[PDB]
């Protein structure tokens, strides 16, 4: 079978995060379900494994009593709840499965895995994004091609898509990635090269869409008059 | 290093890999000087294997 999880999610430093693990079909209330995490920079840790048919929690000695995993046999869905998030909790969790066997070793193996729920937490929480246009000058344009675009600043959280004329301009468009700031914020850019003959006849506009914040602010661009 | 006025060992090229072993022993710690000069010698060390 296949186990599907939720998408991206951001939280607060000291809040309660609630994710789930969905199962497609059956073969879920007969085998143990664990949770394996993975963080960039270190190895893979293991919090604990939960058996759904009888309901016994089996955690490890390295993790204290701060996370609880509850499962349900009516809809075959396991829930994960964690509180008091820290700065080193920016990782991704996976919904694994245990398939025991016989032998001299008898080690827990993970044959079935999940999709992955990227849970990040930091400061500089969600606020209103600021869009700043960019105009080419007479000194920076020596040929028949000019570069211009829009700059997105003071936005949170990821991800944010950038469209040009509602998806009508596909040639020469590039989306730059984000970067961590000292205050814990991201910033990206986008620039398209267009010929200089179409600057005074066809207008350009950046459509900034943000689905977790429900802010859709469009801004037009105008060339400079002095340079 | 340019910013640090000290000789540090960075190129650790003694072997490539190792598959399986049994013997592993750590001796007592010993401090060493990494700065090399062109003067006369001041000590003498003898080793018998």
């Amino acid at each position: 079978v296949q186990l599907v999880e939720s998408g991206a999610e951001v939280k607060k430093p000291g809040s309660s995060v609630k994710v789930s693990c969905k199962a497609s079909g059956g073969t879920f209330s007969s085998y143990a379900i664990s949770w394996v995490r993975q963080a960039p920079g270190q190895g893979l840790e293991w919090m604990g494994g939960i058996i759904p048919i009888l309901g016994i929690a089996n955690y490890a000695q390295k993790f204290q009593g701060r996370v609880t995993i509850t499962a349900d046999k009516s809809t075959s869905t396991a829930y994960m709840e964690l509180s008091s998030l820290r700065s080193e909790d920016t990782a991704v969790y996976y919904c694994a499965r245990e398939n025991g066997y016989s032998g001299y070793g008898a080690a827990a193996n993970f044959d079935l895995w999940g999709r992955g729920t990227l849970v990040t937490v930091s400061s500089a929480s969600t606020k209103g994004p600021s869009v700043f246009p960019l105009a080419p000058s007479s000194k920076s344009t020596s040929g028949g091609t000019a570069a211009l675009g829009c700059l997105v600043k003071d936005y949170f959280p990821e991800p944010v898509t950038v469209s040009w004329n509602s998806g009508a301009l596909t040639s020469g468009v590039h989306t730059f990635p984000a970067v961590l700031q000292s205050s814990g914020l991201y910033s990206l850019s986008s620039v398209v090269t267009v010929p200089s003959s179409s600057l005074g006849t066809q207008t350009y506009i950046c459509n900034v869409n943000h689905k977790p914040s429900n802010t859709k602010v469009d801004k037009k661009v105008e060339p400079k008059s002095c340079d | 290093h340019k910013n640090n006025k000290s000789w540090m060992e960075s190129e650790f090229r003694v072997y490539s890999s190792a598959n399986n072993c049994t013997f592993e022993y750590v001796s007592q710690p010993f401090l060493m000087d990494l700065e090399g000069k062109q003067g006369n010698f001041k000590n003498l060390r003898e080793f018998v294997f």
Partner: protein, 213 residues
């Protein structure tokens, strides 16, 4: 933690590449079976081999696992175009009361040829100055590979504050592109004479300057 792994290993496309996994005498040497996984950067890891004696469905037979005493070994034959991932050790530890993973090895010699970069310096516009901030951007594009050292200067001293470098992504024409921001305030943006971003790429230093007045 209790399981260590080499940080990197070199190999050739067509010879045998072996890896070694060392731990303690209570998790791997006690008698427990080992499990090897593959961590591809962009998808979920799957099962490769369990118990070092059976073969799951969907895995090629080129992977060979063995347990020689207290250490486990993984040997492969032939390097294809999908071995750009990490290999880990998973073994049941009794002192930790659970399963613990290893360090992880990266399998990748290189594959990044050189090229000639091209930078573009763009000054902030008029609408950005009233926001009590100044974001001086410096776009680099059409270069290979994506390893550029970004430096800033104000014609009298290098700027060691507010410097940021993003990672480059692959374009449609097998090129890379990145951008560098500089957080300043509009109070001191007009006081200095000019601003510039200096970068290097295999000794090639391209310099571009702008003037606010």
């Amino acid at each position: 933690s209790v399981l260590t792994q080499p940080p990197s290993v070199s190999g050739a496309p067509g010879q045998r590449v072996t890896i070694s996994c060392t731990g303690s005498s209570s998790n791997i040497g006690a008698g427990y079976d080992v499990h090897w996984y593959q961590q591809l950067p962009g998808t979920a890891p799957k099962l490769l081999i369990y118990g070092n004696s059976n073969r799951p469905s969907g895995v090629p037979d080129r992977f060979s696992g063995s347990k020689s005493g207290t250490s486990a070994s993984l040997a492969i034959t032939g390097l294809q175009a999908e071995d750009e991932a990490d290999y880990y050790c998973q073994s049941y530890d009794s002192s930790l009361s659970g399963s613990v993973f290893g360090g992880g090895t990266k399998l990748t010699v290189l594959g990044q040829p050189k090229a000639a970069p091209s930078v573009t310096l763009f000054p902030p516009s008029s609408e950005e100055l009233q926001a009590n901030k100044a974001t001086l951007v410096c776009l680099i594009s059409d270069f290979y590979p994506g390893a550029v050292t970004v430096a800033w200067k104000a014609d009298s001293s290098p700027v060691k504050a507010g410097v940021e470098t993003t990672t480059p992504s692959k374009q449609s024409n097998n090129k890379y592109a990145a951008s560098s921001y500089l957080s300043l305030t509009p109070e001191q943006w007009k006081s200095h004479r000019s601003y510039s971003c200096q970068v290097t790429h295999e000794g090639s230093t391209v310099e571009k300057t702008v003037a606010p007045t």
